[model samples]
Target chain A: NLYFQGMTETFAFQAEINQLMSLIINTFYSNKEIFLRELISNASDACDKIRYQSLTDPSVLGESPRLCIRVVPDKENKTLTVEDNGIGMTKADLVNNLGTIARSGTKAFMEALEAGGDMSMIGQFGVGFYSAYLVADRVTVTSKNNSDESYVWESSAGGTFTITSTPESDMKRGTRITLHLKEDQMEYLEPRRLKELIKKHSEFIGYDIELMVE
Target chain B: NLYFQGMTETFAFQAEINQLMSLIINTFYSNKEIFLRELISNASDACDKIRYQSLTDPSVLGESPRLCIRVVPDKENKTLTVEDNGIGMTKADLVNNLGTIARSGTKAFMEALEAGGDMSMIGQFGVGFYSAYLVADRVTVTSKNNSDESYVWESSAGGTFTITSTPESDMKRGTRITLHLKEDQMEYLEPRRLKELIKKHSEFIGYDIELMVE
Candidate 1:
């Protein structure tokens, strides 16, 4: 396929986040299962975002908004993925969102830096996302936004990551994040375990979350 | 009164923000009165946040939360200040929120980085705040959060700002943002003009907004 594809870029994790990331892993170690819920909520937020903007006359609602989160368990491969057909992210969004913890204002929107209010409620999306590392040795995030091309972000949560033009994109848009289960953390591959966590933490989130049993 | 005070530090505005700031000023120049609405909503958010977090047993509510926004007009100095008696901010919040449009994840709460959402609804606080500059030559933000001492943030919006330990903090907790009005924008310093703007834009906000006139 002839395309003006971008080159792969590797980025260092924010030095400041190294301490915070480990502390986070320790803090949530006892409650490590909530990672799925965080992913689900992110998916919900993504869907809610596009669903609202599709109403932008502002611009025309391009397509009827489709919103759903799917949990795919690969027993043979020892991986679990939370996939959503929501607002897919651009390649740039993947780098900004996943490459660093304490990031520069790369995708700097004005309100990204909030002052006041609950510390926990503040800047917690990517922070809460680190919980994925507790049960994962490696994670792969493949995303496509309406504004940019598809890209895959892969990391060991070590200290770095690499992004490349996605070779294949199954969904037309949205994201699919796969966690290669840590050997001991393989219990997450069970459909029912993910079910309980979904029902427990994300019962009220306004989107459909399904566990794919194949 | 003796206190362990800090010295003033001047910071350059983000190099990237220069182009963006002027565009923002021009875009919203017509809908100028909405600036009051942004400040009111910010005040309301601050109040709702504290009201919710006073529930942290987690931690105890130190003071029964007071929720109000006051507009103080100094006709002589040609300044208009929007003051909020709600959850205040730290010195760090002042610099990060005001000094630069694209800042580091300085207060790197895990989620300070959101991956997706409405662009207008995203990091638009400080950007929307630039409307203050539409009518003023200088802006000063004095804020005090419960956990730290108060600090003052002043900027010309010409690309630089200074932060110093506040000389005198009038409110026990909260923020007071004073706009040193440009001579041509004298109407904003008039009480009736401000009252009409407030009634038109902020009527539905949940807190009391009072205009003080001498």
Candidate 2:
């Protein structure tokens, strides 16, 4: 897979990935504003999972009970990292969950595409995660969950993604997705833009989330 | 209070209330019809309270565990009702909470008032309940909470309200508010309008809400 700009340009969708891509970028994710919405939703889910889990095990929280989401931008590195101290994904989960588009709103997203509407579907169905491809050709997902061993998931848009079982002892106990943005999507590399997106979409989430850009 | 013509007689708000009223009727809720929104939001809060309490007392669900909101209208009778099978209110609650101006959005209502924006802003807050006052001169709120005696809160908006106990007479769990509309607000006393409000605003609520009108 060729790297475009700073992003890895290849990852796998289903057999109809190209068709879906045309349907999404041209129609489903048309608003271009829903990127932050979906990411915030993922963070909310993470926070909820932690909250729910805390009900069963008291010490599971390990004293740091504050849930947070952060967006870090590196212009020099050409990377945008969205980190959430929520539920971390497992190796199998990354391959199975992120690789395929599986969301109840698929038909709705497609219907919106067909209708040529601009309301980007903020759902994590198969197409939402792939939205990183809109700005970046390559992506890296570093995650550490209490229930699962920490792992790194990497992909370029062409098709296959690699799951590396790395023991980064210092990794925080959640997920951080790093997007190596395409030149066209370099706007995402700006800290202000990332913060603005978070405010517009996830401001209502009952948690403190921040964006740091360099 | 002086009852004006059923058709075009203007329902003036106190200068401040008037400003907010026009803004609400004209702008904020215009883009999204939200009668059902307030009702559903309140209903969800009721359910959440019950669910939270149920954690300590399993007997709370001894009678019925189903939570819901229902909208019904009687065109022939010129009446509409919003009922919720959640935590119903007591006599004191109705007099204090239901028969008040805050039933809608006082602050936004104030904004519209101060700005002289013409739109309707019923119940952005507690002000939403008074929205019934916008369309009707008289409202009857019948309610029964598990913790308190069931009571009816009635008002015609003359700076005072009446509370009476309804006979156990076939009362089920929860609260039901029925509005007796003025001739102009008769349009709101329609089943179709209630459905439209639900679709436009409260379709996201998690409940089996239904409406029947005659």
Candidate 3:
């Protein structure tokens, strides 16, 4: 199915997708503050990937090789967003990265999930990206990769997700993860807590991490 | 099942049981030292359970309700044991407590493990006893409940477990957890380490935590 600019193509995750989210959220809730740590780790990875590729093909870095991560909290909009200027994802990358469950060992995990089988043996690869659901009710990811067109992906911890094409003229390389925080999770929007966590977990990351808290 | 004293019944965990052990071990390994803390906490719970039951029936306490926790490390055998005089478990209790996985929400966890659906969402209730597998190759539980006979349960993180019946003539009410240390985890056999961990985690326990190091 072809969709023009501003049009969205929604995809229903495989039936097991809902179950996957339910399982992951519980684990993350026990260690909720670490969600920021996970997002920043992902951001650093994205920056590093593009840096590695830029050595071979400098064009991918384009005019903006400023590899940095920005955590912006919008109190009015009630959202917490993490922005990264690095190797952004394309439509396929979005589906693979954001859509699939345990993309590493899908078949193996599936084999362990069945009735009559002790049902207790499901191996969790412990995907880090899903930590976003710990604090946010909904998550929106906008990414632009050098090899493909810009796209926006959105989900609300449900069994399905939506991917929409963005206008080519407004393309910006990198990824932006916006979390619609839950009412109770608004503490993440606090300037002091956000700053503390970013420093606590990501201080060792090589890339520059900018904060909108100031 | 009809054997006399010293009789052992080996039961294979459902096929998925092996998978469950593998999954649980990985999570616990990330927080290994907490294994001692978990045991102490469990020991405290056992003592509290029996203490509460003693209110209704003083006879259950017998001549001595020496509600306490004991951690003994044997370097020669390369084993670490946690002993507690508390509410012990019966044969049925052992099977239900140690046999099934995620006893709290078994059915819900089972539904989450299947094919075609997204494999990402598995909720981990995080059982405390299973943390023993973090630094242990084998775990043995010997307990005697007042209402039933004493039994010994043994497992090596394998799919199957063996339960053996001990003679009623020499029954000691309470539970003793002995962990056969893995080669790499032999450090737990150290006396100072055991003392430090017990004080570090269980310093606040109501009953005395007797250590054999002295």
Candidate 4:
């Protein structure tokens, strides 16, 4: 428990990224619906990583061999949770990929896309995950990797993020991202609205996408 | 003098930039001529800055108010110097702009271009300045701003750069960038080859770009 307590870290986005975020947030204002597209696209990418890894190292799947994403909209809490049963991340991965802008798993995915190897990979700029900040007042990411302990990453687009380790028993193996919907963004908590978005943007995702409407 | 020396600083590019440089360099193996286009485009932007500034405060132009770029090909030294009588940079400006890859003057230049204000602004990527490293063993940028002491920014692209103050009396105004051509890149020292590159890629630049053949 003492060791785990010391594992937490906090970070601020590099000074260079502060200005660009506003520009990017504004650039995609006309297509705010793409935020859902970006998140689902990233979720699909995680599943693909595990599918590829399981090819040579089947043990990587261990107990959870099935790959899928579950979207649960909680009306009572005014939140939307997207969980994936796929390759999760370590603390370093969270800081390096999500804490920084334009740096993520998406770059290699984009190159693969450019080579026409897989049309399922959709992240090029690597800032797609931050799109959650577009509609959410706060975002929480809880991920558990097979090789590492589970960790929680939370941020409010307030320039910094905090990461804390969780007991391995608390999570299985994968990532769950919860968005605390803004007052206006509460529409995302609606079952019908989410179904429409999933059908519109993420219908092509190969993995099974389960929607928990209730 | 000791106090002035204290102002100089050295910086390393972020570790993430190392691989991207190689990827970009490989991507442009066939279009080496774009280096000149990038530099000339940057010079034109510097000129645009001064031209816009002089409108509000005529004194910003200093004694040499003409906005132009001079390309001097030195066969004896095997170098190409692109000098511009435009709004120059202070040490902070140099670091904040040139010291980092994407933090340079190009972002605003890109937004302007994207808005269709000017088709001639060619720097959207902000990595265009690094293209100089594609052809040169080392790059030296000497700049004199109307408000700050002159300074020199030099880098070998090995990973870091050094900045030092130049005597204010020795400098007039604007920036001068000199590329020490690599042995194989000595062709750039040829007046005829440079003329062809300028005509092919940078003829539309608004500033008067004079070529010194002799």
Q: Among these predicted structures, which one has the highest lDDT?
A: 3
Writing each residue's lDDT as its tens digit, candidate 3 over B1-214 gives 1112234565555444456566555542334777787788778888999999999987899866778889998888888899888998988888767765335344334345333222223324335576677788889999888888988888897677877764443477889999998778887888887878888866578888988873
The fraction of reference interface contacts (C-alpha pairs within 8 A across chains A and B) present in each candidate is 0.00, 0.00, 0.00, 0.00
Q: Write the per-residue lDDT of candidate 4 for residues A90-203, one digit (tens) a residue.
A: 767876666654443444544553465432223344456766766777889988887877888877766667676534345688899999987777878888988889988665
Model 3 CA deviation exceeding 4 Å by range: A1-5, A25-28, A104-126, B1-214
Write the residue-wise lDDT of candidate 2 on B38-139 in tens digits: 656777777777767778986775587877778888877887788887777765566445433232356665665567653344443346655555566577
Q: Give the alpha carbon lDDT tens digit for every residue of A87-189 in model 1.
A: 7888667766664545433222113423322223323534656667778878898887877778788777666677766344444678889999887888899
Indicate the residue-level lDDT of B177 in model 1: 86
When summed lDDT is taken over every stretch of 10 residues in candidate 4 chain B, the lowest stretch is: B1-10
Best by TM-score: 3
Alpha carbon lDDT of residue B130, candidate 2? 50
- Give me the displacement of residue B61 in model 4, in angstroms: 59
Put down candidate 1 lDDT per residue, B126-171, tens digits, no spaces. 4556557667778888888888888877777665677665344444
DockQ of candidate 2 against the true complex: 0.00
Model 2 residue runs over 4 Å out of place are: A1-12, A16-30, A100-108, A122-126, A167-171, B1-214
lDDT of 4 by residue, B44-126 (tens): 98999999999999988778888899999988888899999888898678876775545434445445534754423334545
- Report RMSD (Å) for each prediction in the order shown: 22.9, 26.4, 25.2, 22.2
lDDT by residue (A1-214, candidate 2, tens digit) is 0100111112345444544544444432334656656667777788889878988975666756788888888888888888888878875676557655445565555666567544455353346665666566778888877778777777675545555542334456788889887666777776677777877776578878887745
> Candidate 3 chain A — worst ten consecutive residues by lDDT sum?
A114-123
Model 2: per-residue Cα lDDT at residue A55:
86
As for lDDT, the candidate ahead, 2 or 3, is 3
Question: A78, model 3: CA deviation in Å?
Answer: 1.0
